[PDB]
Amino acid sequence: PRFVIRRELVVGEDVQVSRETGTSVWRPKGTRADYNNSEYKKVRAERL
Amino acid sequence: MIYLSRLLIDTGGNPDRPRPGRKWLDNIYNVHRRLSMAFPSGLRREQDPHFLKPFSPNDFQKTPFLFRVDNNIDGNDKRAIIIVQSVLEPDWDYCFQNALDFLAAPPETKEYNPEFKAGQLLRFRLRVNASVRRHIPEMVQQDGQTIETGKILHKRVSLTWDASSTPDQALADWLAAKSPKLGFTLQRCELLQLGWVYGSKPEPKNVKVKEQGQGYWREHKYNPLRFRAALLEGVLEVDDPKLFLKTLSSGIGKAKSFGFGLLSVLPI
Numbered sequence: 030p031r032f033v034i035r036r037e038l039v040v041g042e043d044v045q046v047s048r049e050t051g052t053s054v055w056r057p058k059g060t061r062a063d064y065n066n067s068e069y070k071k072v073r074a075e076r077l
Numbered sequence: 078m079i080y081l082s083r084l085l086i087d088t089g090g091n092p093d094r095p096r097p098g099r100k101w102l103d104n105i106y107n108v109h110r111r112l113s114m115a116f117p118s119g120l121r122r123e124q125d126p127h128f129l130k131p132f133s134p135n136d137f138q139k140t141p142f143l144f145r146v147d148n149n150i151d152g153n154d155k156r157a158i159i160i161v162q163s164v165l166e167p168d169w170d171y172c173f174q175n176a177l178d179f180l181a182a183p184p185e186t187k188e189y190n191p192e193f194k195a196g197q198l199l200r201f202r203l204r205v206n207a208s209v210r211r212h213i214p215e216m217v218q219q220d221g222q223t224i225e226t227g228k229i230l231h232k233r234v235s236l237t238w239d240a241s242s243t244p245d246q247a248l249a250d251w252l253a254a255k256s257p258k259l260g261f262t263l264q265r266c267e268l269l270q271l272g273w274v275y276g277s278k279p280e281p282k283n284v285k286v287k288e289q290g291q292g293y294w295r296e297h298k299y300n301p302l303r304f305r306a307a308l309l310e311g312v313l314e315v316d317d318p319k320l321f322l323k324t325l326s327s328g329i330g331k332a333k334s335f336g337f338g339l340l341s342v343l344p345i
């Protein structure tokens with residue numbers, strides 16, 4: 030046997046909170062290219 | 078031998094519907110390029126039997142062919158005729174296989190072996206580029222005042238006549254001046270049409286360097302093309318059968334790459 034006590038700590042004054050630091054939802058990649066971006070016009074002119 | 082080919086275009090019908098064939102004739106550069114696409118190389122045709130690959134002029138044969146565009150042919154229908162004279166057999170089924178909308182009739186081709194004796198009368202039709210080369214002072218700006226610059230420009234401009242001379246006389250003299258060398262002598266010459274021919278040409282222009290290297294990014298800039306056109310029809314007489322055949326299949330003026338040199342002869 031051993032003797033055991035219980036206490037408490039209230040967050041925000043003695044224990045801090047960390048940020049998320051990551052991404053949870055995966056989601057697919059990005060379609061829908063832009064027709065007003067300068068790079069798109071440059072590559073379109075080059076292709077022409 | 079010579080190869081003579083004929084193409085037909087509608088240039089009529091409902092004006093509220095697309096007409097690619099009639100629109101194709103608005104630029105002489107496009108017409109010249111399309112006619113040049115009718116002479117493919119022996120390797121390009123084998124590699125691409127359907128003409129569905131990017132177009133590069135380096136894959137097509139170079140040969141000085143001539144052509145003319147005629148209009149106003151009747152029979153209750155409108156027609157524009159393209160007449161092509163060449164030293165090679167054209168491949169029309171390879172050029173128009175994906176553009177059958179352009180034509181109103183199948184292309185026709187035939188052989189041509191013109192043998193003319195000395196002192197023979199002929200009926201001729203031909204279009205000329207009336208151009209002379211001159212030194213011109215450089216006037217610029219014209220922002221309400223004309224400012225002269227000391228440089229003198231070597232420029233090819235239109236043929237001009239005096240105030241007391243008609244254009245027909247000037248053109249007849251201008252053609253009879255050179256007719257000794259070509260190999261024929263005129264008998265009558267009358268002017269039918271006098272005007273301008275327009276076109277536009279693309280040109281590559283560098284813009285920025287490539288971050289990965291090995292080239293630039295490039296763009297297209299358009300350069301105008303203007304020519305002075307005059308159509309003539311009349312009667313001629315062959316001086317010697319040697320130089321006349323050289324005059325044919327060669328052209329009787331400049332701008333021969335834009336349908337400006339072609340002699341059409343009939344036996345009268």
